[PDB]
Design a protein around this nucleic acid. Structure first.
Lengths: 52, 207, 198, 49, 175, 195, 171, 52, 174
RNA sequence: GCUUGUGCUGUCUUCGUCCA
């Protein structure tokens, strides 16, 4: 149930998650749930896209 | 993760046949569909399409001398005992001899240790099961004859008591349906029972 | 109408259907008209006004369906034809090394009797495949050495000494159909070595 | 197909004069097309049309 | 998954004394279940003293993580592995790592955490029944086999003892 | 009796868990000269039951997970025509398999496996990255999940115009590309497997 | 509830059994086909009174098949549950969905929705049970339940009980 | 020990034949082979055998 | 399988409310009606049986059959094994266990006294036989308990229920 | 290694055959 809520929240915000911290700053997840799930979900980083 | 698993001979055999290498091995007995009959070899197909083979020394009994063609026919199905399995080529060798097909019954390695198995109770139960397999069916015999009466020996003697000397009565014998006892009055309160053996009987109730 | 007065109970009144609501009493056989649980029957357990709860007959579990979808049918008489992928008494491969025979069939489930005797309840999708064995493969050999084909009646000698007619053959196991064993609609599994042909 | 024989027909589906014919034997071979079944699941040369 | 496991628990938040008893109970249960592993640890690592004390401390820390911090098994296994293993330097300055717990043991600790709450509820009910009995002098047998009781079978035995020997008070409160 | 039952149930639970862990712990097949975990390009073949009538159906899946160029062969697989068709199919510029997977319903699949392996070895059909050259690998594929996939309504909705054997080939290719997700796609049906 | 009923059975006999022991063979066939059977119309037939002295009459030869048809009338003890009846029972199995009891040969299933809430199911208990503060019902425990609904099968009867009313539950 | 049902229906084909006449099996060794004791219990539930 | 002595019952148009089985309303259906007919067509009353009467009858019939089958030469298990049919053996075993574990009267004379008290009584001359069987079977202790368990007895308030229950408890062996 | 396939229209009209 939490996965479907997370997917719907991401699709509301724009179907793209820029940063891991946005699971907390955008109120998408709670503190302990994020603390559990932070290192097991990842965002592919492309150096050509992020020069900064 | 670990590397992609690549199937071995046993896994390929289990995949393609759905028979494990445990339930299909040396010594087991299975029914096989005969397909070819020759003078020296026989080719059969098992239930899972594994092509079998039997040689001349494994088709016929040692005391037999008839040709293999006369003994078996194409399309017949028989019991055979596995002598070798080739798990890579899906081929097996079998034997139709009595020593292999029937004697090998205890195919499981049950731990029959005397301290860990109730040997005597098993023997008693098995003996009782054989004593129940010895049970048979039986019924009385009916014969149509004017001087025949379905009576016992003492009953026949009592029946002949009311009749004078020389009258004859016929009763079934205790030795079986193939025997007939004829009782005739020798003297007052003296009777002779004579057993008659029947040959070339058309039926048990027939004469 | 039904009322405490006898003189009122002997009167028939014609009433429009637009002002009638069905009354469902606890412990009545009812068959579902329409919905996801269509053609499910069972006994009413709880009547929460508009919503009615009943223990099913097929799934044997409580199902909550609205009262508008219920008809009082005292008998199920559900036909399972034109459903699933499996006729009754089909020899179905459950998985890689498991097989069985369909004993009872349902709209979205099946009852399978294993070769060893264990009964299973599975959805149709979970069944691995259906074994369409050839007629030559569907032949076995009794304890005497006499061939026994499908439809041949045989009777055991070991064990309980039961009797039945051959329904399916798998390896050394014979699936037999019998009149007196009502426990599994006559279907009991025995090895061919245990039987003698009649 | 029918229970009779078809080996007495020629390539054009017609029997030739001078041939012996018994009851039920096929003397004129004719076929009509039929929209094929789901046999396009794979039947290399044995799908009925 | 923790919510699904704890959905049947009437009350999960234990007091401090009950929580310490829970930790001790889980340590004892793991000691009982992992006897062969502890024997192998003691025999093959004889040079290191008091490894079983380190095992007890590690099990208590894992119970602390699971109960208070509510960490699930993969997170503990990945990011808290230093509490699940012990390291030492031998006489030859050899760095040796000993793995006290594995992932299956973490799942077993979760299972024991779930299991102990039924024991706690049964013990609380039995103590409440004893309070309603209101003995003038504390029964030495009851306290003796209530302090050491660690399975619900012994609690049931104490319940049978209490309802037999003090049946009159039970009848008065209420065969 | 209850205590021993509970203990034995715990032990059997952990044994079943370890067996299932051994089942699902598989990485995707690693093509040579490529880093582990890279999704390969897969070609799968199967005639089905192996009978006289049954034709061979092929499905090619690229590393992006898109099914490309399903084909049907209209000749006996023991003939030279099937070998020529397969050689033309594999050597086509638009198809570049990294591995060839084969699975089937009975022992006739061994003949197909041997035929494809002999054809690949004799013709020296090498992997086309379009230096060192490596022949394409031919393996048997465990079809635990494909047989349930071919009947699933999700597969039918995904590919309405395709037969069951095409869905079986797609299931085999998907299993080669990602075993874990193929096990996950079974949903309630994965408890009925032989664990 | 048990009753005495006058029942009848139609017995067909093959001509191969036309012997002096025809009456006794018909008696044993009737006993095997009646003792222990379950008919939804009648309930459960447990025993047949005077089983060795039942009149069988004269059998009628069926035209075109040779076999004789016998009309056998007998008195037997029959048990059948009724809707809205309270009877005793013994619990045979405990499950989260409810408990299964046995009333002779009949098995009665009671769902949790017909069980009072204070009898909370305890799966950790040895053996598992539906227990309350003052009540504990497990396998083999005497229970008094009221039959609410009866389900009739081809040769089987399924009953549903309830314990939510007074003078029910543990006894 | 075997009931009458167990005395008849326990055939070599059956999985319960392994422990049909077992004795002197210690409790300490049961946990090594959980399937054996589970099969014993399941046979008991069928009314075939009795574990003493 | 077995057919009742009551036949006919052809199609009509009227529908009645006294057709559904209901113990509380004392509507036992046509096949269990208060008036029955024997093989001779004579009038016959519905024969209810309490667990004591049923147990006595089944024990008597079973021991008579066992004696007859043995050439005229007590254990429940052997007596059940006398009967034929594995499913029949299981059914008779279950009934024997149920009757044994709930036998209110294991003596013939006590059962005879109970039957005479429940039949020859003036108040019980109006009582339905099903009510008599329920009272002798369930072993109720209170008038209110009997009324709650047996709703039919609520409408029959001219019955000395309490003293009959106390006599039944007295006759019941403690 | 290779195996054999399993059925039939309807409705009118006309002309005939053996009696009557």
């Amino acid at each position: 149930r939490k996965a479907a809520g997370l997917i719907q929240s991401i699709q509301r915000i724009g179907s793209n998650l820029v940063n891991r911290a946005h699971l907390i700053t955008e109120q998408l997840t709670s503190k302990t749930v994020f603390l559990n799930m932070a290192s097991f979900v990842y965002i592919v980083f492309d150096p050509d896209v992020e020069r900064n | 993760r670990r590397d992609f698993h690549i199937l071995n001979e046993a896994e390929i055999f289990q995949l393609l046949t759905r028979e494990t290498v445990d339930s299909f091995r040396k010594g087991m007995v299975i029914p096989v569909y005969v397909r070819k009959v020759e003078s020296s070899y026989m080719s059969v197909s098992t239930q899972s399409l594994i092509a079998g083979n039997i040689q001349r020394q494994d088709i016929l009994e040692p005391n037999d001398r008839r040709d293999p063609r006369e003994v078996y026919s194409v399309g017949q199905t028989v019991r055979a005992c596995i002598l070798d399995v080739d798990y890579y080529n899906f081929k097996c060798q079998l034997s139709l001899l009595r020593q292999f097909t029937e004697n090998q019954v205890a195919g499981l390695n049950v731990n029959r240790n005397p301290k860990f198995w109730d040997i005597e109770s098993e023997n008693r139960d098995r003996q009782e099961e054989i004593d129940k397999q010895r049970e048979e069916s039986r019924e009385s015999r009916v014969i149509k004859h004017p001087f025949f009466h379905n009576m016992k020996s003492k009953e026949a003697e009592d029946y002949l008591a009311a009749r004078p000397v020389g009258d004859v009565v016929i009763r079934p014998s205790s030795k079986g349906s193939n025997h007939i006892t004829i009782s005739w009055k020798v003297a007052p309160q003296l009777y002779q029972h004579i057993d008659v053996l029947e040959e070339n009987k058309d039926d048990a109730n027939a004469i | 109408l039904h009322s405490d007065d006898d003189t009122i109970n002997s009167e028939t009144v014609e009433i429009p259907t637009s002002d009638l609501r069905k009354i469902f009493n606890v412990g009545d056989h009812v068959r579902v008209i329409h919905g996801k649980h269509t053609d499910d029957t069972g006994l009413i357990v709880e009547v929460n006004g508009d919503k009615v709860e009943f223990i099913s007959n097929q799934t044997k579990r409580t199902v909550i369906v609205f009262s508008n979808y219920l008809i009082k049918s005292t008998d199920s008489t559900v036909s399972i034809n034109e459903s699933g992928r499996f006729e009754l008494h089909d020899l179905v491969q459950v998985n890689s090394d498991l097989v069985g025979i369909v004993i009872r069939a349902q709209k979205d489930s099946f009852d399978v009797l294993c070769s060893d005797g264990k009964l299973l309840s599975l959805p149709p999708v979970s069944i691995y495949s259906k074994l369409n064995l050839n007629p030559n493969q569907q032949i076995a050999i009794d304890s005497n050495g006499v061939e026994v084909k499908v439809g041949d009646t045989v009777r055991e000698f070991t064990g309980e000494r039961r009797q039945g007619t051959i329904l399916h053959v798998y390896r050394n196991f014979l699936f037999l159909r019998s009149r007196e064993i009502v426990e599994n609609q006559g279907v009991f599994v025995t090895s061919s070595n245990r039987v003698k042909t009649i | 197909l029918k229970h009779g024989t078809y080996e007495k027909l020629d390539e054009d589906g017609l029997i030739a004069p001078g041939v012996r014919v018994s009851g039920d034997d096929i003397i004129i071979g004719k076929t009509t097309p039929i929209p094929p079944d789901t046999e396009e699941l794979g039947q290399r040369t044995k799908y009925h049309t | 998954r923790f919510q699904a496991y704890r959905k049947s628990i009437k009350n999960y938040k234990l007091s401090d004394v009950d929580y310490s008893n829970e930790r001790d109970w889980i340590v004892e249960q793991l000691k009982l279940e992992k006897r062969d592993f502890l024997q192998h640890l003691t025999q093959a690592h004889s040079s290191v003293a008091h490894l079983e004390e380190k095992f007890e401390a590690s099990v208590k820390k894992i119970v602390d993580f699971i109960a208070i911090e509510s960490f699930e098994v993969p997170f503990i296994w990945n990011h808290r592995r230093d509490y699940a293993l012990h390291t030492y330097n031998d006489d030859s300055n050899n760095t040796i790592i000993v793995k006290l717990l594995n992932e299956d043991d973490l799942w077993r600790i979760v299972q024991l955490d779930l299991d102990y709450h039924s024991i706690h509820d049964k013990k609380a009910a039995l103590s409440s029944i004893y309070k309603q009995l209101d003995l003038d002098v504390v029964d030495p047998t009851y306290e003796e086999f209530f302090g050491s009781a660690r399975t619900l079978s012994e609690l049931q035995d104490i319940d049978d003892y209490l309802t037999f020997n003090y049946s009159s008070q039970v009848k008065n409160l209420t065969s | 009796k209850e205590s021993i039952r509970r203990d034995c149930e715990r032990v059997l639970y952990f044994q079943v868990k370890n067996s299932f862990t051994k089942k699902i712990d598989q990485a995707p097949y690693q093509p040579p000269t490529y880093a582990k975990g890279t999704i390969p390009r897969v070609l799968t073949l199967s005639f089905g039951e192996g009978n006289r009538g049954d034709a061979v159906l092929g499905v090619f899946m690229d590393d992006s997970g898109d099914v490309k160029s399903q084909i049907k062969f209209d000749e006996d697989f023991q003939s030279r025509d099937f070998s020529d068709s397969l050689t033309r199919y594999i050597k086509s510029n638009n198809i570049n398999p990294d591995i060839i997977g084969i699975s089937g319903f009975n022992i006739h699949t061994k003949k197909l496996f041997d035929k494809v392996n002999e054809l690949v070895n004799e013709e020296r059909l090498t992997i086309e990255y379009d230096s060192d050259k490596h022949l394409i690998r031919v393996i048997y594929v465990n079809d635990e999940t494909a047989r349930l996939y071919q009947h699933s309504s999700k597969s039918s909705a995904e590919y309405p115009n395709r037969p069951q054997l095409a869905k079986y080939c797609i299931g085999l290719a998907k299993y080669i590309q990602s075993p874990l997700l193929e096990y996950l796609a079974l949903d309630e049906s994965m408890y009925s497997l032989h664990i | 509830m048990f009753f005495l009923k006058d029942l009848s059975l139609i017995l067909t006999l093959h001509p191969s059994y036309f012997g002096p022991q025809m009456n006794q063979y018909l008696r044993e066939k009737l006993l095997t086909d009646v003792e222990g059977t379950c008919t939804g119309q009648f309930g459960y037939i447990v025993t047949v009174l005077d089983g060795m002295n039942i009149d069988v009459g004269k059998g009628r030869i069926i035209p075109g098949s040779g076999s004789a048809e016998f009309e056998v009338k007998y008195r037997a003890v029959v048990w059948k549950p009724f809707k809205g009846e309270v009877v005793d029972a013994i619990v045979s199995n405990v499950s989260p969905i409810g408990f299964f009891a046995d009333v002779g040969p009949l098995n009665v299933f009671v769902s949790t929705r017909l069980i009072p809430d204070n009898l909370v199911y305890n799966p950790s208990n040895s053996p598992p049970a539906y227990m309350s503060n003052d009540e504990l019902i497990t396998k083999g425990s005497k229970v008094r339940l009221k039959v609410v609904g009866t389900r009739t099968d081809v040769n089987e009867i399924y009953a549903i009980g309830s314990i939510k009313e007074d003078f029910l539950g543990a006894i | 020990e075997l009931t009458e049902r167990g005395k008849l229906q326990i055939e070599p084909e059956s999985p319960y034949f392994d422990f049909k006449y077992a004795k002197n099996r210690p409790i300490s060794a049961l946990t090594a082979t959980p399937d054996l004791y589970l099969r014993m219990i399941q046979a008991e539930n069928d009314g075939l055998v009795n574990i003493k | 399988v077995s057919t009742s002595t009551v036949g006919a019952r052809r199609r009509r148009a009227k529908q009645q409310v006294d057709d559904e089985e209901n113990a509380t309303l004392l509507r036992l259906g046509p096949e269990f009606a208060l008036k029955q007919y024997d093989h001779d067509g004579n009038e016959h009353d519905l024969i209810a049986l309490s667990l004591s009467e049923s147990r006595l009858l089944i024990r008597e019939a079973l021991k008579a059959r066992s004696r007859a089958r043995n050439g005229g030469v007590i254990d429940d298990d052997e007596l059940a094994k006398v009967t034929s049919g594995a499913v029949a053996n299981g059914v008779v075993k279950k009934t024997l266990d149920y009757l044994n574990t709930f036998a209110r009267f294991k003596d013939e004379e006590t059962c005879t006294a109970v039957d005479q008290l429940l039949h020859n009584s003036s108040d019980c001359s109006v009582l339905h036989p099903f009510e008599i069987a329920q009272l002798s079977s369930l072993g109720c202790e209170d008038v209110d308990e009997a009324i709650t368990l047996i709703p039919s007895l609520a409408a029959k308030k001219e019955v000395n229920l309490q003293r009959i229950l106390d006599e039944l408890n007295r006759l019941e062996d403690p």
